[PDB]
Amino acid sequence: AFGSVGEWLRAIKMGRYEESFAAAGFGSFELVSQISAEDLLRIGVTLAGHQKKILASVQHM
């Protein structure tokens, strides 16, 4: 378990997206667990490799 979405993003080397997750309203794991590729694109994860890494990480929840 992570203490916050930030801690999670940081842990999976995706800390660069912290502010953009938070501003888009993804501040709980309940929301992030339902995240899709379209969501990731909307908030600014433009790289498919980062999208894949993020989505593979959430598929654990």
What minimum distance in Å lies between the beta carbon of 51 and Cl ion?
Answer: 22
| Calpha distance 61→24 (Å, rounded) | 20
C-alpha gyration radius of the chain: 10
Task: Provide the minimum distance between the beta carbon of 10 and Cl ion in the complex, in angstroms, as a whole number.
Answer: 8
Q: Is 33 in the site for Cl ion (CB under 5 A)?
A: no
Work out which of 4, 28, 33, 34 binds Cl ion, going by CB under 5 A.
4
Could you say which DSSP state residue 49 is in?
H
Q: Is residue 6 near Cl ion by the rule CB under 5 A?
A: yes
Q: Which residues bind Cl ion (CB under 5 A)?
A: 4, 6
